[PDB]
């Protein structure tokens, strides 16, 4: 719905530590795993990184 509470402006997204942050350093939660904003990351066979809050995997 259109709920009521404490938000912060749309340029800012909520971080775990009570602050909210722009999406630049907004970590990724791939598999739940809290990747830092720049994490290059891959098996032999997959290839994955965290860009901006989204986790870009490939194969």
Partner 1 sequence: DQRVSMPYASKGLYLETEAGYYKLSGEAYGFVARIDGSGNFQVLLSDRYFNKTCGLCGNFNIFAEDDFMTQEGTLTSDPYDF
User: Closest CB to partner 1 among 17 and 44?
Assistant: 44
d(CA 22, CA 24): 6
- Name the site residues for partner 1 (rule: CB under 8 A): 42, 44-45, 47, 58
Beta bridge partners of 29: 34
What is the nearest approach in angstroms of partner 1 to the Cβ of residue 41? Answer: 12
- How many Cα neighbours within 13 Å face the side chain of 37? 8
Which of 31, 43 has the CB closer to partner 1?
43
Minimum Å distance from CB 56 to partner 1? 8
């Amino acid at each position: 719905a259109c709920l009521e509470g404490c938000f912060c402006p749309p340029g800012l997204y909520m971080d775990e530590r009570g602050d909210c942050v722009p999406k630049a350093q907004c970590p990724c939660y791939y598999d739940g795993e809290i990747f830092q904003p720049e994490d290059i990351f891959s098996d032999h066979h997959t290839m994955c990184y965290c860009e901006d809050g989204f986790m870009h995997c490939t194969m």
